[PDB]
Amino acid sequence: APSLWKGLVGIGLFALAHAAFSAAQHRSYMRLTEKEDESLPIDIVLQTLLAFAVTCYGIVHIAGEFKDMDATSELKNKTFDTLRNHPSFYVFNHRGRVLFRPS
């Protein structure tokens, strides 16, 4: 799922860049002709707004963690069996050691 969102964001960014290039070409043509104070066509403006909204949707979905405020639910499935043993004090005197000695 995240890969699809990343691809959609990339496609939206590419569409935005293409709309930018089209607007730049429009302004370059406008500089050619005297007067004719007209705005850029509305179709490209709608396309760039569509690219603005599409990339704005996946940018929220990419980084969603929203971890729970309560910390009692994170030590909830953990049992006391694993907590009893500690990495610090570790005695290497067990029957399994001499059981596994020969293979």
Partner 1 sequence: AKVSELYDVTWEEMRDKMRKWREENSRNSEQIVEVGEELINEYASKLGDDIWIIYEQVMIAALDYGRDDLALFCLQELRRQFPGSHRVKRLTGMRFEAMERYDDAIQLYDRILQEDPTNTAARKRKIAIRKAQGKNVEAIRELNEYLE
Partner 2 sequence: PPFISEAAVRGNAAVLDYCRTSVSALSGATAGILGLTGLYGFIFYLLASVLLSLLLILKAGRRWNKYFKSRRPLFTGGLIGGLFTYVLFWTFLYGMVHVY
- 70 sits in the region (left: phi over 0; alpha: psi -120 to 50; else beta) called beta
Q: Cβ distance 48 to 19 under 8 Å?
A: yes
Contacts of 44 (CB under 8 A, 6+ apart): 19, 22, 23, 26
Q: How far is the CB of 61 from partner 2 (least distance, A)?
A: 8
Site string for partner 2, 59-98 (x = CB under 8 A): xx--xxxxxxxxxx-x------------------------
Could you give the 3-state DSSP secondary structure of residue 101? Answer: coil
Look at residue 20 and give the partner it binds from partner 1, partner 2, none, a contact being a CB closer than 5 to 8 Å depending on partner kind. Answer: partner 2
The span of 2-10, 20-28, 60-68, 95-103 binding partner 1 (CB under 8 A) equals 95-103
User: Hey, what are 101's tokens?
Assistant: 């000695």
Of 51-90, binders to partner 1 (CB under 8 A) are 78, 82, 85-90
Binding stretches for partner 2 (CB under 8 A): 16, 19-20, 23-24, 27, 45, 48-49, 52, 55-57, 59-60, 63-72, 74
